[PDB]
Amino acid sequence: LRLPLCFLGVFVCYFYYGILQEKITRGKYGEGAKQETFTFALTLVFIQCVINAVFAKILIQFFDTARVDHTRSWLYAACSISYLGAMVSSNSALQFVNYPTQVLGKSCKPIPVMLLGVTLLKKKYPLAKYLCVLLIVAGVALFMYKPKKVVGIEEHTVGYGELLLLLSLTLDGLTGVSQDHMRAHYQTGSNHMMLNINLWSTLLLGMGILFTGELWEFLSFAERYPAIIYNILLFGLTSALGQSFIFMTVVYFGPLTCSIITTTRKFFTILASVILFANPISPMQWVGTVLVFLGLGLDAKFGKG
Amino acid sequence: DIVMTQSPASLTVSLGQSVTISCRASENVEYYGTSLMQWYQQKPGQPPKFLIYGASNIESGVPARFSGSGSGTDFSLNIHPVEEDDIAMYFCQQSRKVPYTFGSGTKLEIKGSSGEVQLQESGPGLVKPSQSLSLTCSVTGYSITSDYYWNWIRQFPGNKLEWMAYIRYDGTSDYNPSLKNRISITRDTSKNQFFLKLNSVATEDTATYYCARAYYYDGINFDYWGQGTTLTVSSENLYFQ
């Protein structure tokens, strides 16, 4: 095998990644009054970054090493700050909003990328953008927004979760801009970029977690429920593996296959999180996910750079 | 490796004519939408002067007349108002892969005919084949421990350039795969020098060697050049000639 017929690697890796994230973040830790929700987000991102960095280092060591990097360290730091900010904000968003909403919000990169490109790069997309984005807008309005906001979440001031989601989207857009500019101007390979940004994010996260007095403190939580020690680790590992497998898709059959695989994986994750953990999705809502995914696929198919 | 080709060997122009020089590559030289093409100018008896990077960006200080265009595997350098100043040989270079190469070059002629870093070369003049050789490049006004690449290049008779090797201030060094088994590059930050050592030279190394400084942006660009030192290898002691 090894062909796109069954790319079990990425599929299983990201499936386990999503299921583990939903289990750990929204896990019903404790019983009754003695309940402690998962309020720790920096530690998880720090562990994930460390595992990704070590796997990237091993991958580069075991693969071609003739390439010599030409990028500057401060550029890596500038990318990493936004990268870690986006990851941490998105992860923290799960403490208020439901998981399907979080994944739907994190699956809306086209809007921010188009906005940043128009504002600064001034790139014009007569048909690819400004015309197919209406589908994304309609879908997101269907799911996250009510008919007139009068039934459901109500028109009251949204919780901090949606604002955190917006912050994550903005940071993701900025990170994408920085990565694209650096790649265009310095010709940096994927492995070196991932390793450097992960190392910088690891250092910053370590300093922050030590200042916040969490690592020195939160270990009592793990002690009370030692199981979380194992599960979280597994989660991180999965992410790393995905990246490695993603590299294959980059070199084999181009990136369109990887994009479509990511889209279908996101849809499958929505289905699983709505069918396994029983997070009811109101009527006239699934159509919104359908609209958003259809728009994303059409963009990835028609009018794709 | 890529074999750059320059079609017009030589050209003749008056003062007030548009001059366009073509350049072709055997493989695509664009990476993520950016073209890695450099254009240099070399007057007779002088080191090449860095002119254009990216095939469209004019280096600071170059007069506005010069311009570049093209993409894919075809590029062209254009000067509309040629003056007396710009009469020299123009080279096109690619930086898509490690063995950077220069074209055969095109010659243009008019019808009818402390703050700056200083680099100085030194070494032997005459040497018999089958004997190891060493050359030194000394840098003043600057420290080689800052963010800059330091390269050794050589030019054969007929003006066919061939990049030899380079070393980065971090200590990382790169060699030409053809010469990787013969030449070595070393440095010394105490005396602010760097040396190139060749093993078992032959008669084919007769050429002029330059040491240059470069910085990476949309491909390596050799901003500063030394005066260059000659090296003649033959089976005799040149006397009374």
Author numbering:
A (entry chain A): 12 to 316
B (entry chain B): 1 to 113, 485 to 612
Please, what does the article write about this entry?
Here we report that human SLC35B1 does not bind nucleotide sugars but indeed executes strict ATP/ADP exchange with uptake kinetics consistent with the import of ATP into crude ER microsomes. We have further determined seven cryogenic electron microscopy structures of human SLC35B1 in complex with an Fv fragment and either bound to an ATP analogue or ADP in all major conformations of the transport cycle. We conclude that SLC35B1 operates by a stepwise ATP translocation mechanism, which is a previously undescribed model for substrate translocation by an SLC transporter.
After processing and refinement, the SLC35B1 structures showed good fitting into the cryo-EM maps reconstructed to a resolution of approximately 3.4 Å. The SLC35B1 structure had the expected DMT-fold, which comprised two structurally similar four-transmembrane (4-TM) helix bundles made up from two overlocking V-shaped transmembrane helical pairs of TM1–TM2 with TM8–TM9 and TM3–TM4 with TM6–TM7. The middle of TM4 was found to be broken between the conserved K117 and P212 residues and was therefore designated TM4a–TM4b. Bundle closure on the luminal side is formed by highly conserved polar residues located between the ends of TM1 and TM9 together with TM3–TM4a. In particular, hydrogen bond interactions were observed between E33 and N290 and between R37 and N109, which are located at the respective ends of TM1, TM4a and TM9. SLC35B1 structures with and without AMP–PNP addition are mostly equivalent, apart from the extra cryo-EM map density for the nucleotide.
